[PDB]
Design a protein around this motif. Structure first.
Motif, PDB file in Angstrom:
ATOM      1  N   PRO A   1     -15.002  -0.817   0.325  1.00 30.61           N
ATOM      2  CA  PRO A   1     -14.748  -1.638  -0.422  1.00 30.61           C
ATOM      3  C   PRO A   1     -13.520  -1.099  -1.295  1.00 30.61           C
ATOM      4  O   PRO A   1     -13.772  -0.344  -1.498  1.00 30.61           O
ATOM      5  N   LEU A   2     -12.844  -1.846  -1.521  1.00 26.83           N
ATOM      6  CA  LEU A   2     -11.491  -1.915  -2.077  1.00 26.83           C
ATOM      7  C   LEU A   2     -11.680  -1.559  -3.837  1.00 26.83           C
ATOM      8  O   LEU A   2     -10.892  -0.785  -4.301  1.00 26.83           O
ATOM      9  N   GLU A   3     -12.638  -2.416  -4.267  1.00 29.91           N
ATOM     10  CA  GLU A   3     -12.984  -2.381  -5.713  1.00 29.91           C
ATOM     11  C   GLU A   3     -13.233  -0.716  -6.485  1.00 29.91           C
ATOM     12  O   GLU A   3     -13.150  -0.253  -7.381  1.00 29.91           O
ATOM     13  N   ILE A   4     -13.748  -0.151  -5.382  1.00 36.68           N
ATOM     14  CA  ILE A   4     -14.512   1.192  -5.203  1.00 36.68           C
ATOM     15  C   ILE A   4     -12.434   2.445  -5.141  1.00 36.68           C
ATOM     16  O   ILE A   4     -13.254   3.507  -5.646  1.00 36.68           O
TER      17      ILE A   4
ATOM     18  N   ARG B   1      -1.827   5.129   7.744  1.00 35.29           N
ATOM     19  CA  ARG B   1      -1.966   3.644   9.141  1.00 35.29           C
ATOM     20  C   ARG B   1      -2.624   3.364  10.047  1.00 35.29           C
ATOM     21  O   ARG B   1      -2.513   3.904  11.175  1.00 35.29           O
ATOM     22  N   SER B   2      -4.093   4.661   9.713  1.00 35.27           N
ATOM     23  CA  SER B   2      -5.325   4.626  11.222  1.00 35.27           C
ATOM     24  C   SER B   2      -6.506   5.363  10.492  1.00 35.27           C
ATOM     25  O   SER B   2      -6.254   5.781   9.642  1.00 35.27           O
ATOM     26  N   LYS B   3      -7.153   4.659  10.937  1.00 32.86           N
ATOM     27  CA  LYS B   3      -8.787   4.729  10.512  1.00 32.86           C
ATOM     28  C   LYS B   3      -9.675   5.410  11.591  1.00 32.86           C
ATOM     29  O   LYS B   3     -10.263   6.104  11.019  1.00 32.86           O
ATOM     30  N   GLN B   4      -9.468   5.016  12.437  1.00 33.55           N
ATOM     31  CA  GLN B   4     -10.289   5.815  13.456  1.00 33.55           C
ATOM     32  C   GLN B   4      -9.970   7.412  13.537  1.00 33.55           C
ATOM     33  O   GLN B   4     -10.826   8.135  13.973  1.00 33.55           O
TER      34      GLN B   4
ATOM     35  N   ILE C   1      -6.614  13.409  -1.126  1.00 32.95           N
ATOM     36  CA  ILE C   1      -7.966  12.565  -1.119  1.00 32.95           C
ATOM     37  C   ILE C   1      -6.951  11.505  -0.178  1.00 32.95           C
ATOM     38  O   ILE C   1      -6.088  10.783  -0.293  1.00 32.95           O
ATOM     39  N   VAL C   2      -8.043  11.029   1.112  1.00 30.12           N
ATOM     40  CA  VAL C   2      -6.803  10.332   1.940  1.00 30.12           C
ATOM     41  C   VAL C   2      -8.279   9.092   2.045  1.00 30.12           C
ATOM     42  O   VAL C   2      -9.157   9.469   2.393  1.00 30.12           O
ATOM     43  N   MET C   3      -7.531   7.929   1.754  1.00 29.98           N
ATOM     44  CA  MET C   3      -7.826   6.530   1.638  1.00 29.98           C
ATOM     45  C   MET C   3      -7.519   5.428   2.575  1.00 29.98           C
ATOM     46  O   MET C   3      -5.975   5.578   3.225  1.00 29.98           O
ATOM     47  N   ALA C   4      -8.505   4.658   2.989  1.00 29.89           N
ATOM     48  CA  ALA C   4      -7.250   4.126   5.277  1.00 29.89           C
ATOM     49  C   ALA C   4      -6.511   2.205   3.342  1.00 29.89           C
ATOM     50  O   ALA C   4      -7.050   1.929   3.061  1.00 29.89           O
ATOM     51  N   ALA C   5      -5.188   2.302   3.813  1.00 33.82           N
ATOM     52  CA  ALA C   5      -4.066   1.079   3.387  1.00 33.82           C
ATOM     53  C   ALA C   5      -5.486  -0.268   3.392  1.00 33.82           C
ATOM     54  O   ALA C   5      -5.778  -1.213   2.412  1.00 33.82           O
ATOM     55  N   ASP C   6      -6.680  -0.850   4.915  1.00 36.33           N
ATOM     56  CA  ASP C   6      -7.155  -1.754   4.425  1.00 36.33           C
ATOM     57  C   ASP C   6      -8.630  -1.035   5.206  1.00 36.33           C
ATOM     58  O   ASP C   6      -9.110  -1.671   4.948  1.00 36.33           O
TER      59      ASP C   6
ATOM     60  N   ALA D   1       0.393  -1.662  -0.536  1.00 36.28           N
ATOM     61  CA  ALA D   1      -0.060  -0.272  -0.231  1.00 36.28           C
ATOM     62  C   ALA D   1       0.702   1.308  -0.071  1.00 36.28           C
ATOM     63  O   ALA D   1       1.298   2.055   1.397  1.00 36.28           O
ATOM     64  N   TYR D   2       1.448   1.707  -0.816  1.00 35.63           N
ATOM     65  CA  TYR D   2       2.669   2.780  -1.263  1.00 35.63           C
ATOM     66  C   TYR D   2       1.659   3.773  -2.569  1.00 35.63           C
ATOM     67  O   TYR D   2       0.597   3.416  -3.254  1.00 35.63           O
ATOM     68  N   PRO D   3       2.509   4.775  -2.054  1.00 31.30           N
ATOM     69  CA  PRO D   3       3.221   5.572  -1.329  1.00 31.30           C
ATOM     70  C   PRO D   3       2.508   4.884   0.536  1.00 31.30           C
ATOM     71  O   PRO D   3       1.399   5.179   0.315  1.00 31.30           O
ATOM     72  N   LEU D   4       3.980   5.932   1.681  1.00 34.16           N
ATOM     73  CA  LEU D   4       2.897   5.132   2.640  1.00 34.16           C
ATOM     74  C   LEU D   4       3.562   6.502   3.117  1.00 34.16           C
ATOM     75  O   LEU D   4       4.869   6.672   3.491  1.00 34.16           O
ATOM     76  N   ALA D   5       3.229   7.690   3.660  1.00 35.26           N
ATOM     77  CA  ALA D   5       3.319   8.327   4.617  1.00 35.26           C
ATOM     78  C   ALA D   5       3.802   7.718   6.388  1.00 35.26           C
ATOM     79  O   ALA D   5       2.710   7.095   6.717  1.00 35.26           O
ATOM     80  N   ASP D   6       4.577   8.217   6.351  1.00 33.54           N
ATOM     81  CA  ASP D   6       5.301   7.905   8.590  1.00 33.54           C
ATOM     82  C   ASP D   6       4.287   9.064   9.344  1.00 33.54           C
ATOM     83  O   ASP D   6       3.583   9.707   9.173  1.00 33.54           O
TER      84      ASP D   6
END
Length: 128
Positions: free
Chosen positions: A62-65, A84-87, A54-59, A10-15
């Motif tokens: 639905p990912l298909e969308i 790396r944070s959905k909450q 645009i911000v989305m969770a790596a997990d 799931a890149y790129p990734l931010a610290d």
């Protein structure tokens, strides 16, 4: 000891730091009477011609969308960043739950633009 077909992770990734400062950008949006938190709805933000953030969770599913948003690639103007944070994304957008895919609309001739435009370059740097 690695020369096989690994995963993109799931890149790129931010610290954790980059995500912290970036997260504030989301909450700040609501302050400008502007906000967005929806995968299916996100398709409208880009189709309207105002999808700069645009911000989305790596997990996030639905990912298909999540892959439907981007038509071609960054070259076709398509912002996106994994966190790396959905909450946190759920409270940032302004909802009592973990958001799947959110975006921030940019305003023309606005003081916020001076900031969004600066932080925006951060995403691009990771895009290409």
């Amino acid at each position: 000891m690695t020369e096989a077909d690994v995963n993109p992770k799931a890149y790129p990734l931010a610290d954790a730091h980059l995500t912290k400062k970036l997260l504030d950008l989301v909450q700040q949006s609501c302050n400008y009477k502007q906000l967005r938190k929806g995968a299916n709805e996100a398709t409208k933000t880009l189709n309207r011609g105002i999808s700069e953030f645009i911000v989305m969770a790596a997990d996030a599913e639905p990912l298909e969308i999540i892959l439907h948003l981007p038509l071609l690639c960054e070259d076709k103007n398509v912002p996106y960043v994994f966190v790396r944070s959905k909450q946190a994304l759920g409270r940032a957008c302004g909802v009592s739950r973990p958001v799947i895919a959110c975006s921030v609309t940019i305003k023309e001739g606005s003081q916020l633009k001076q900031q969004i435009q600066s932080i925006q370059q951060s995403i691009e740097r990771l895009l290409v």
